[PDB]
């Protein structure tokens, strides 16, 4: 199912159907939704971290009326929306093969750190299907247009390193250090001005469809808000005092 562990500001979720390569069934989507509810509502959890159990990250949807709209509409869409909605930094530690919904889900994390031997398999087209879970939204922005089209149309593997070189993910590390480095970053982010970070993430999300003019109003808006937070005050005094800042995330 889904293993979850909270420690030191960091909520770490583990996709846990190891033999199936943590492919999703209906029961797994429900447990994930439940865990996310906690991340959203509990404000001591100031970083989420997704990762897979066993050797794979997520092979996506377990493929065993033909209305694929409903699956999208019930499971992946609210999951994707709320993750995008979450005013908290989300890290995807891709520890192995990420296929179908698993790849597009992984690629949609704010910061993605992939093991060296991990590969992203978006073979939707081979099944006469389309990349879901924001697939067709993400690829053009994460890889640029010519490559998103190439990846989605021909539909074949992308290694961690290729993805990296291509700008699609943030970092690639030796398999055996992945769990460590990801958890390193999450612990770090979980002590950073979470509110500020949440506005940054929202602003950047929003800028994809805003003009510069609209976006300058939104930045003024977010700065105005950020500069009233406790963490702004803390951050300008810690710096002035050459001491290390203690953020609460408000």
């Amino acid at each position: 199912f889904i293993l979850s562990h909270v420690e030191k500001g960091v909520m770490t979720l583990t996709l846990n159907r190891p033999e199936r390569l943590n492919s999703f069934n209906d029961e797994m989507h429900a447990q994930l939704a439940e865990c996310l509810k906690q991340v959203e509502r509990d404000d001591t959890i100031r970083c989420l971290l997704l990762t897979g159990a066993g050797r794979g990250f997520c092979a996506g949807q377990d493929l065993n009326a033909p209305d694929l709209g409903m699956s999208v509409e019930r499971f992946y869409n609210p999951l994707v929306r709320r993750l995008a909605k979450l005013p908290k930094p989300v890290i995807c530690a891709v520890n192995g093969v990420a296929a179908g919904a698993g790849a597009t889900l992984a690629l949609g994390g704010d910061i993605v750190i992939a093991a060296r031997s991990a590969k992203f398999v978006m073979a939707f087209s081979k099944l006469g299907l389309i990349p879901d879970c924001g697939g067709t939204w993400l690829l053009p922005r994460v890889a640029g247009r010519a490559r998103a089209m190439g990846l989605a149309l021909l539909g074949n593997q992308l290694s961690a390193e290729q993805a990296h070189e291509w700008g699609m993910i943030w970092q690639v590390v030796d398999d055996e250090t992945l769990a460590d480095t990801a958890q390193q970053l999450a612990r770090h982010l979980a002590t950073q001005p979470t509110f500020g970070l949440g506005l940054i993430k929202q602003a950047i999300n929003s800028a994809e469809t805003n003009t510069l003019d609209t976006q300058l109003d939104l930045e003024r808006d977010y700065q105005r808000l950020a500069g009233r937070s406790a963490d702004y005050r803390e951050g300008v005094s810690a710096f002035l005092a050459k001491r290390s800042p203690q953020f609460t995330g408000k």
Binding site: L218, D221, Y222, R224, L225
Partner: protein
């Protein structure tokens, strides 16, 4: 409790305050809204009112019980419809600052207002139809006038909500701000208005009300006569003097 009243210069703030009931429009609440606005109408120290709820709800309809214990006979003689007519009769700029849900009565209360500023997560809706009823406070008249037949009919006949963004593109709302700024930005809007001549505001607003009441030609004549009214006021002099010699005008309300 129920309605908080607060003040910022000639701006009056009215906060629906029934959290546990999703700010549902109580009979008591409605009456308190009516008493406050009727008091402000004649308070010369007030120029503008803002109505808001909280972040999660503006107003999520009206008390469902108060509406059930009314039968054919009790519905005919209900007090509420005149309350709504008195709210509409308020003669000063009325801005709705909507966060979260504005549904049924809540939505009809935002449509009642002159201007709606919404938050990024606002939702507008008329779910009356799902309950075996329909809008009974202007929903079926005011919506269709600002967003047109197709959308208003869909909303009224199916009862599905729309987002703050759909709402602005449709004309139901004229602003969309981050949730934490809606109220503050609504108040700034209000303070800009409240900086103008009070009588001008009242005549301009009356002009606007009447556009919904008459054909264009008569609307023009009526606008002419409210115009001419202002020509006769002291503040007209002050307003353009302060503008031509570049200062901030001080209006006497005459």
């Amino acid at each position: 409790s129920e309605l908080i009243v607060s003040r910022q210069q000639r701006v009056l703030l009215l906060t629906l305050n029934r959290p546990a009931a999703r700010n549902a429009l109580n009979n008591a609440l409605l009456m308190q809204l009516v008493n406050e606005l009727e008091a402000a109408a004649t308070d010369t120290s007030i120029s503008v009112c803002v109505i808001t709820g909280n972040a999660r709800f503006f107003a999520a309809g009206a008390d469902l019980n108060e509406m059930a214990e009314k039968d054919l006979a009790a519905t005919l003689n209900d007090t509420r419809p005149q309350l709504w007519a008195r709210l509409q009769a308020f003669n000063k700029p009325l801005i709705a600052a909507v966060n979260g849900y504005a549904l049924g009565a809540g939505c009809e209360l935002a449509l009642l207002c002159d201007v709606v500023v919404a938050g990024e997560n606002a939702r507008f809706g008329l779910p009356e139809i799902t309950l075996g009823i329909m809008p009974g406070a202007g929903g079926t008249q005011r919506l269709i006038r600002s967003v047109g037949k197709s959308l208003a009919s869909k909303m009224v006949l199916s009862g599905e909500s729309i987002t703050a963004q759909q709402a602005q593109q449709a004309g139901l709302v004229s602003d969309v701000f981050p949730s934490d700024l809606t109220l503050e930005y609504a108040l700034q809007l209000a303070s800009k208005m409240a900086r103008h001549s009070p009588l001008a505001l009242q005549a301009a607003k009356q002009a606007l009300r009447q556009s919904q009441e008459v054909a264009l030609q008569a609307g023009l004549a009526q606008e002419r006569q409210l115009f001419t009214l202002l020509a006769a006021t002291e503040d007209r002099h002050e307003g353009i003097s302060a503008f031509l010699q570049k200062r901030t005008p001080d209006f006497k309300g005459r």
